[PDB]
Amino acid sequence: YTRVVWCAVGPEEQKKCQQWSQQSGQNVTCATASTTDDCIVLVLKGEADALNLDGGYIYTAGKCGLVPVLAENRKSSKHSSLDCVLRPTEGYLAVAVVKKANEGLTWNSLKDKKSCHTAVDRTAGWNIPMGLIVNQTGSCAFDEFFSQSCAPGADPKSRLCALCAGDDQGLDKCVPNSKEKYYGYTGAFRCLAEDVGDVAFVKNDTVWENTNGESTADWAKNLNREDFRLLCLDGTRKPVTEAQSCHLAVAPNHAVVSRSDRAAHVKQVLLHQQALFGKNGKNCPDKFCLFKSETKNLLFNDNTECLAKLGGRPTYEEYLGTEYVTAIANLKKCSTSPLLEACAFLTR
Amino acid sequence: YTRVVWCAVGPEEQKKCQQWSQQSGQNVTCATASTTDDCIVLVLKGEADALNLDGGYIYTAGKCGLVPVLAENRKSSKHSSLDCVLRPTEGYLAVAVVKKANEGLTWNSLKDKKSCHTAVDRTAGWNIPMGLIVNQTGSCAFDEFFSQSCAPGADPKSRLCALCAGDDQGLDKCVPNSKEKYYGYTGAFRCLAEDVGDVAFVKNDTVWENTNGESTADWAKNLNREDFRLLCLDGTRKPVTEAQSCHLAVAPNHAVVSRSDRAAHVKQVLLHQQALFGKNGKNCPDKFCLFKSETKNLLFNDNTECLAKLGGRPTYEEYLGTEYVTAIANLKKCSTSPLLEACAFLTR
Ligand SMILES: *[C@@H]1O[C@H](CO)[C@@H](O[C@@H]2O[C@H](CO)[C@@H](O[C@@H]3O[C@H](CO)[C@@H](O[C@H]4O[C@H](CO)[C@@H](O)[C@H](O[C@H]5O[C@H](CO)[C@@H](O)[C@H](O)[C@@H]5O)[C@@H]4O)[C@H](O)[C@@H]3O)[C@H](O)[C@H]2NC(C)=O)[C@H](O)[C@H]1NC(C)=O
Ligand SMILES: *[C@@H]1O[C@H](CO)[C@@H](O[C@@H]2O[C@H](CO)[C@@H](O[C@@H]3O[C@H](CO)[C@@H](O[C@H]4O[C@H](CO)[C@@H](O)[C@H](O)[C@@H]4O)[C@H](O)[C@@H]3O)[C@H](O)[C@H]2NC(C)=O)[C@H](O)[C@H]1NC(C)=O
Ligand SMILES: *[C@@H]1O[C@H](CO)[C@@H](O[C@@H]2O[C@H](CO)[C@@H](O[C@@H]3O[C@H](CO)[C@@H](O)[C@H](O)[C@@H]3O)[C@H](O)[C@H]2NC(C)=O)[C@H](O)[C@H]1NC(C)=O
Ligand SMILES: *[C@@H]1O[C@H](CO)[C@@H](O[C@@H]2O[C@H](CO)[C@@H](O)[C@H](O)[C@H]2NC(C)=O)[C@H](O)[C@H]1NC(C)=O
Ligand SMILES: *[C@@H]1O[C@H](CO)[C@@H](O[C@@H]2O[C@H](CO)[C@@H](O)[C@H](O)[C@H]2NC(C)=O)[C@H](O)[C@H]1NC(C)=O
Ligand SMILES: *[C@@H]1O[C@H](CO)[C@@H](O[C@@H]2O[C@H](CO)[C@@H](O)[C@H](O)[C@H]2NC(C)=O)[C@H](O)[C@H]1NC(C)=O
Ligand SMILES: [Fe+3]
Ligand SMILES: [Fe+3]
């Protein structure tokens, strides 16, 4: 138990992880499963040590006994002097994104509309919007709010997966990993852009990164960010530049989780793996780049500078925050998770 | 599914249930329908979990296999050293009410007069009076005993709905929910207090709470209990103070019902929701008051202290009393309702 076993979600993340493994000199090793839930189970079983997770998936990890180790830190706005690994994290902005053309679409008219989600149980994709919808309507029938959606991880037969497109061969529709066309921050924005859905629940950063020649890929090549607007809670629409006052909520940053008996080991190993393969480390881009992907947002968000430290060994609760923990728990009163039920049974 | 789905009857109850959901953090959720019967269908099919029913409606729910969970308890007449939840449940007094200026009018000259009813199938408004009238005239022809009525829930083409006024714009005449200005205890009494009717079938408490400056509603603002008499079975009229000597019968109190499989979960959640939002709850009146209405008697009677444990898991027969069940059963021999016929096979 000196090798750190990384859990990779789907085959695209498996490739990057294999590459990482070789260059690490087996200091880091790979297990795979097809979903993040499946990977959380591997860590519980001891068939893997760690992966990097959306705050939403950190809630599942936490309820099953896992702890946060290090957080994603992206480019800040100020305090450039302090070292990235010591520089306090900020936390992204969950926004609802429409095409300006879609006329008279506000927060207050989303009922019966078409939705694109990162995946079920992710913070910007699901917890935040569906938390607010459920609370506003006083109804747990979130599964019938949108006429149709692509929400990878949902029931593949339901209206919540109706819009999902699968891989190149239209196969594995709605499976929550990179191979599904509309999976993730990128996939959900691409679902809005190809006008398959009226609204997309992503983070502010995703909107910028795939408009005004900022991404090479074709679906996003010619996209211009005056053709997109942000929905605000009050009802108003605002330009994508207004996210600071037209966001649904502030999300905690994606973080690495492991068993509590492996945190310190995983911490120490990953700091060293960063100094090697991070943004400004000895062997990027010479050998291998840990925070860059052949496709997009594999193991870590491409927008990641470093993995940063946390204050005083925090619980998943302390990490995510009292308020976002109450919102998730409240939304989850409307659903049943076999994973959470198992974990309640075998952590009591 | 930890959420309890409450069934609100009509849009005024829906607004109160949405508030309740929000302040309970989705410990409670709202389904709605236009009528109590429709809501009993929702609970049967598991689309809703519970609602608070008049004893007449508890008989319909019981025949369709639902069980009583908790009973409404009002401020006792005597001294109770016990907590409201454990204090015994008294029962309310079913009375006939008239203007005193209606000379000649007794129990014995009711035939061919104008009646106001809380609604069809309710204990005081309907099962008590009409049961005695079918018994006493020896005829099933109770639909023609009064010349005209408001009895919300009856055939809106028949004379039983002739006097019903509906809502602001007189839409939804005779629908058995609070949009109908003459619906329920409040509505039946307002019907007598604007001389649309000659007799109103309500409970003792209804007259007190709406006479002698004791409500803010304009139709009631300037009512005097001296202007009203009570009809007794002996043929005499007495004042509203003689309710104990001048009542048609004793009604079992309104009670929450659910399916047998959700009863324990619904009991646990409600006992805790009234600790928070009941008469002496931490969060009433700052956040939400479970037993107050913007209008009147929404979800619960506004004169409800707490909801109170029953005996050991009773049935609808045990809760209602063999005497009332047989009085109801004999009145239903003269009539058919869809829900009783649909469910008849369950207990035959
Ligand atoms: C018909 O309908 C009507 C429904 O409105 C009924 O009228 C209502 O009846 C009740 C009484 O039956 C009234 O409510 C009472 O209000 C008093 C205070 O105003 C309240 O408190 C006293 O009662 C007992 C006495 O034992 C105790 O709980 C209290 O004692 C405590 O406090 C004192 C000091 O202040 C201490 O010394 C003691 O040691 C105790 O700590 C009080 O003395 C009553 O409990 C009760 O709620 C309603 O006001 C009245 N409603 C209206 C609007 O008029 C009527 O009963 C119905 N009739 C029938 C036959 O059912
Ligand atoms: C929404 O999402 C966007 C992410 O895609 C955010 O836009 C980015 O925001 C930062 C602004 O804080 C941009 O980073 C910049 O990068 C510069 C270097 O290339 C920085 O350094 C320069 O400026 C200062 C001078 O004071 C010094 O650090 C240094 O001397 C240097 O000259 C800039 O300071 C700046 O941070 C980033 O490029 C933006 N990305 C894109 C593609 O536009 C946006 O902030 C997010 N919105 C909210 C409200 O959070
Ligand atoms: C929504 O429902 C839940 C019920 O699931 C309420 O929270 C629960 O409330 C109980 C009793 O208040 C809590 O128990 C307390 O916890 C501590 C620590 O265990 C204990 O020592 C105390 O004596 C007390 O019993 C319980 O923790 C909690 N349960 C869960 C699952 O969170 C909540 O209050 C309800 N919210 C609203 C707004 O109604
Ligand atoms: C793999 O892990 C070990 C850390 O345990 C690294 O080995 C150390 O390397 C430095 C010089 O690079 C030595 O001075 C240390 O004494 C070594 N420690 C041990 C225990 O061998 C190694 O660098 C790592 N390799 C990669 C590719 O990350
Ligand atoms: C659920 O929604 C309601 C309103 O839509 C929120 O409750 C309001 O919040 C304010 C500020 O905290 C309270 O003071 C008001 O009393 C509430 N208004 C109403 C109409 O109830 C509630 O906080 C939301 N819950 C969550 C978790 O966001
Ligand atoms: C009216 O109701 C009375 C009861 O209030 C009925 O008389 C009872 O009938 C039962 C069986 O049918 C007898 O066993 C009891 O002895 C009677 N009770 C009393 C108190 O006398 C009567 O059948 C009803 N009559 C009509 C015409 O409906
Ligand atoms: Fe996220
Ligand atoms: Fe009643």
The class by helix and strand makeup of chain A works out as: alpha+beta
- Name the largest protein-protein interface in this structure: A-B, 14 and 17 residues
Quaternary structure: homodimer
- Morphology of chain A: globular
Largest sheet of chain A: 7 strands, mixed
Distance between the termini of chain A: 26 Å
**Number of helices in the DSSP assignment of chain A:** 11
Number of domains of chain A: 2
| Ligands bound to this protein structure | a molecule of 5 linked components (NAG-NAG-BMA-MAN-MAN), a molecule of 4 linked components (NAG-NAG-BMA-MAN), a molecule of 3 linked components (NAG-NAG-BMA), a molecule of 2 linked components (NAG-NAG), fe (iii) ion
Q: Round the Cα radius of gyration of chain A to an integer and report it.
A: 19 Å
β-strand percent of chain A reads 15-25%
Order of helices and strands of chain A: EHEHEHEEEHEHEHHEEEEHEHHH
Number of DSSP E strands of chain A: 13
- Helical residue percent of chain A? 25-40%
PDB class: isomerase
Keywords: C-lobe of lactoferrin, isomerase
Assembly: dimeric
Entry title: Crystal structure of iron-saturated C-terminal half of lactoferrin produced proteolytically using pepsin at 2.32A resolution
